[PDB]
Tab-separated table of C-alpha atoms and ligand atoms in Angstrom:
chain	number	residue	atom	x	y	z
A	1	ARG	CA	153.273	24.335	17.586
A	2	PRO	CA	152.390	22.382	20.766
A	3	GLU	CA	152.601	19.147	18.694
A	4	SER	CA	156.273	19.600	17.819
A	5	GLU	CA	157.287	19.774	21.466
A	6	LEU	CA	155.152	16.767	22.437
A	7	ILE	CA	157.076	14.776	19.772
A	8	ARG	CA	160.479	16.011	20.902
A	9	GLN	CA	159.853	15.405	24.588
A	10	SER	CA	158.370	11.905	23.998
A	11	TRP	CA	161.171	10.923	21.596
A	12	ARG	CA	163.806	11.990	24.107
A	13	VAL	CA	162.747	9.038	26.358
A	14	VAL	CA	162.862	6.430	23.516
A	15	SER	CA	166.004	7.696	21.798
A	16	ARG	CA	167.953	6.888	24.967
A	17	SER	CA	167.851	3.166	24.079
A	18	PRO	CA	166.887	2.841	20.501
A	19	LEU	CA	167.472	-0.879	19.945
A	20	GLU	CA	165.540	-1.886	23.051
A	21	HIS	CA	162.569	0.198	21.917
A	22	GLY	CA	162.940	-0.818	18.273
A	23	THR	CA	162.885	-4.454	19.316
A	24	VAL	CA	159.470	-3.695	20.913
A	25	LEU	CA	158.236	-2.178	17.676
A	26	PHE	CA	159.236	-5.178	15.636
A	27	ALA	CA	158.058	-7.805	18.056
A	28	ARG	CA	154.696	-6.133	18.097
A	29	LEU	CA	154.760	-5.842	14.316
A	30	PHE	CA	155.257	-9.575	13.795
A	31	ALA	CA	152.567	-10.370	16.393
A	32	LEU	CA	150.112	-8.275	14.357
A	33	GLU	CA	151.179	-9.279	10.805
A	34	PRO	CA	153.268	-12.438	10.746
A	35	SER	CA	153.402	-12.279	6.990
A	36	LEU	CA	155.874	-9.420	7.186
A	37	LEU	CA	158.544	-11.856	8.535
A	38	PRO	CA	159.617	-13.364	5.245
A	39	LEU	CA	160.491	-10.033	3.721
A	40	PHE	CA	163.825	-10.020	5.592
A	41	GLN	CA	165.994	-12.220	3.396
A	42	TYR	CA	169.515	-12.068	4.742
A	43	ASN	CA	171.803	-14.702	3.056
A	44	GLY	CA	168.821	-15.793	0.949
A	45	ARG	CA	167.227	-17.456	4.067
A	46	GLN	CA	163.838	-16.725	5.683
A	47	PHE	CA	163.245	-16.585	9.438
A	48	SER	CA	160.995	-19.329	10.587
A	49	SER	CA	159.751	-17.671	13.812
A	50	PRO	CA	159.749	-14.028	14.965
A	51	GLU	CA	162.230	-14.881	17.644
A	52	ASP	CA	164.728	-15.941	14.939
A	53	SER	CA	164.770	-12.337	13.671
A	54	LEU	CA	166.033	-11.190	17.049
A	55	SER	CA	169.219	-13.214	16.825
A	56	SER	CA	170.163	-11.838	13.383
A	57	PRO	CA	172.736	-9.046	13.486
A	58	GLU	CA	171.502	-7.762	10.098
A	59	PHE	CA	167.946	-7.581	11.448
A	60	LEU	CA	169.064	-5.687	14.477
A	61	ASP	CA	170.987	-3.298	12.239
A	62	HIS	CA	167.775	-2.702	10.327
A	63	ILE	CA	166.053	-1.772	13.621
A	64	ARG	CA	168.828	0.782	14.203
A	65	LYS	CA	168.288	2.167	10.707
A	66	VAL	CA	164.572	2.492	11.416
A	67	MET	CA	165.178	4.329	14.610
A	68	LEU	CA	167.606	6.672	12.833
A	69	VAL	CA	165.074	7.620	10.203
A	70	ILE	CA	162.443	8.333	12.850
A	71	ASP	CA	165.053	10.412	14.737
A	72	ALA	CA	165.661	12.376	11.551
A	73	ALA	CA	161.904	12.973	11.247
A	74	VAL	CA	161.730	14.176	14.820
A	75	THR	CA	164.654	16.548	14.251
A	76	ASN	CA	162.934	17.925	11.199
A	77	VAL	CA	159.472	17.852	12.684
A	78	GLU	CA	159.079	21.620	11.973
A	79	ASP	CA	159.830	21.010	8.330
A	80	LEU	CA	159.645	17.493	6.937
A	81	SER	CA	159.759	18.592	3.280
A	82	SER	CA	163.605	18.526	3.687
A	83	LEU	CA	163.367	14.652	4.031
A	84	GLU	CA	160.937	14.158	1.323
A	85	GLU	CA	163.186	13.079	-1.463
A	86	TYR	CA	165.082	10.670	0.869
A	87	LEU	CA	161.797	9.141	2.166
A	88	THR	CA	160.514	8.717	-1.327
A	89	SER	CA	163.492	6.625	-2.362
A	90	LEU	CA	163.325	4.793	0.954
A	91	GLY	CA	159.776	3.982	-0.027
A	92	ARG	CA	160.864	2.739	-3.428
A	93	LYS	CA	163.496	0.527	-1.782
A	94	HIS	CA	160.823	-1.049	0.448
A	95	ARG	CA	158.529	-1.523	-2.430
A	96	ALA	CA	161.394	-3.463	-4.092
A	97	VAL	CA	161.807	-5.782	-1.100
A	98	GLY	CA	158.108	-6.648	-1.307
A	99	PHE	CA	156.575	-4.229	1.306
A	100	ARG	CA	152.908	-3.354	0.528
A	101	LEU	CA	151.338	0.025	1.084
A	102	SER	CA	148.689	-1.421	3.357
A	103	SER	CA	151.383	-2.609	5.810
A	104	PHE	CA	152.177	0.999	6.689
A	105	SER	CA	149.284	1.137	9.064
A	106	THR	CA	150.518	-1.929	10.900
A	107	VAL	CA	153.930	-0.295	11.288
A	108	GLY	CA	152.186	2.804	12.571
A	109	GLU	CA	150.198	0.914	15.102
A	110	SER	CA	153.361	-0.806	16.158
A	111	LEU	CA	155.106	2.510	16.619
A	112	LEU	CA	152.237	3.777	18.716
A	113	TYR	CA	152.245	0.660	20.811
A	114	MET	CA	155.928	1.002	21.520
A	115	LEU	CA	155.385	4.683	22.531
A	116	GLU	CA	152.374	3.799	24.678
A	117	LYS	CA	154.382	1.119	26.529
A	118	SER	CA	157.418	3.208	26.906
A	119	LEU	CA	155.768	6.465	28.139
A	120	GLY	CA	152.915	4.948	30.054
A	121	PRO	CA	150.840	7.775	31.589
A	122	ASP	CA	152.850	10.344	29.688
A	123	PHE	CA	151.344	8.954	26.440
A	124	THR	CA	148.426	11.381	26.370
A	125	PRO	CA	145.897	11.363	23.604
A	126	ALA	CA	147.513	14.581	22.356
A	127	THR	CA	150.887	12.754	22.170
A	128	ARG	CA	149.157	10.015	20.335
A	129	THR	CA	147.636	12.485	17.908
A	130	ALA	CA	150.951	14.261	17.320
A	131	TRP	CA	152.729	10.976	16.561
A	132	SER	CA	150.006	9.877	14.206
A	133	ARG	CA	150.396	13.031	12.255
A	134	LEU	CA	154.173	12.730	12.189
A	135	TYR	CA	153.906	9.127	11.110
A	136	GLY	CA	151.284	9.948	8.548
A	137	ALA	CA	153.565	12.656	7.028
A	138	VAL	CA	156.395	10.096	6.801
A	139	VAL	CA	154.218	7.494	5.174
A	140	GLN	CA	152.824	10.061	2.684
A	141	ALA	CA	156.430	10.790	1.567
A	142	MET	CA	157.457	7.112	1.436
A	143	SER	CA	154.301	6.290	-0.419
A	144	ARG	CA	155.445	8.330	-3.367
A	145	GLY	CA	157.847	5.407	-3.990
A	146	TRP	CA	154.854	3.503	-5.310
A	147	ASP	CA	154.207	6.881	-7.231
A	148	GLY	CA	150.611	7.596	-6.260
B	1	HEM	C1	158.211	-2.750	8.827
B	1	HEM	C2	158.451	-3.357	7.729
B	1	HEM	C3	159.722	-3.158	7.136
B	1	HEM	C4	160.344	-4.169	6.539
B	1	HEM	C5	159.745	-5.533	6.362
B	1	HEM	C6	161.608	-3.683	6.102
B	1	HEM	C7	162.520	-4.437	5.381
B	1	HEM	C8	163.712	-3.902	4.922
B	1	HEM	C9	164.653	-4.616	4.175
B	1	HEM	C10	164.477	-6.034	3.766
B	1	HEM	C11	165.687	-3.763	3.881
B	1	HEM	C12	166.899	-4.191	3.112
B	1	HEM	C13	167.930	-4.933	3.976
B	1	HEM	C14	168.510	-4.098	5.077
B	1	HEM	O1	169.001	-2.979	4.818
B	1	HEM	O2	168.438	-4.458	6.309
B	1	HEM	C15	165.384	-2.523	4.489
B	1	HEM	C16	166.174	-1.416	4.455
B	1	HEM	C17	165.914	-0.220	5.139
B	1	HEM	N1	164.846	0.053	5.928
B	1	HEM	FE1	163.319	-1.171	6.179
B	1	HEM	N2	161.704	-2.444	6.479
B	1	HEM	C18	160.639	-1.992	7.078
B	1	HEM	C19	160.382	-0.795	7.602
B	1	HEM	C20	161.151	0.294	7.676
B	1	HEM	C21	160.735	1.532	8.119
B	1	HEM	C22	159.348	1.964	8.645
B	1	HEM	C23	161.882	2.321	7.999
B	1	HEM	C24	162.057	3.701	8.344
B	1	HEM	C25	161.177	4.498	8.904
B	1	HEM	C26	162.937	1.554	7.534
B	1	HEM	C27	164.188	2.012	7.215
B	1	HEM	C28	165.032	1.249	6.424
B	1	HEM	C29	166.331	1.811	5.941
B	1	HEM	C30	166.894	3.194	6.280
B	1	HEM	C31	166.890	0.868	5.189
B	1	HEM	C32	168.192	0.956	4.446
B	1	HEM	C33	167.781	1.445	3.064
B	1	HEM	C34	168.931	1.650	2.050
B	1	HEM	O3	169.465	2.740	2.053
B	1	HEM	O4	169.332	0.743	1.265
B	1	HEM	N3	162.448	0.337	7.215
B	1	HEM	N4	164.152	-2.613	5.153
């Protein structure tokens, strides 16, 4: 498929520096939906400001984890049913920490923002479309952790 290669070639650019790009994703995320900030509860404390999250080593590890799951999705872009059972339980885990299904779209928008900023003119509307579909497939799998 032409979509698969668009994903692989765009990801190649981002996967070079995953924390720097991930940090973009999350900064954007908290700008769009500040109420996601309290869900990160390392040492039973809440971040006061988005910038506090950026000084937490656990938070930065979580960014790395995010980027690793996306990398796995990219690698399996030709068949994402292989990740399905993992993504479902990943969904369940996030449901447990207090993530809401409706916040998936914010994460998606954040992902697209990060790609748009990173690729600039290379972020064509076909790249956009490809990534939306990839992201959608991921969310559909994770969503089964709410079962339904
Ligand atoms: C954007 C909102 C999200 C929030 C608020 C959030 C929050 C959390 C929290 C609180 C944990 C548990 C503590 C920790 O491991 O750092 C966690 C774990 C995790 N998150 Fe997220 N997360 C989000 C999104 C994502 C997304 C989109 C992915 C992947 C695509 C991701 C991948 C992971 C992974 C792999 C773990 C470790 C799960 C385990 O095996 O226990 N997270 N997340």
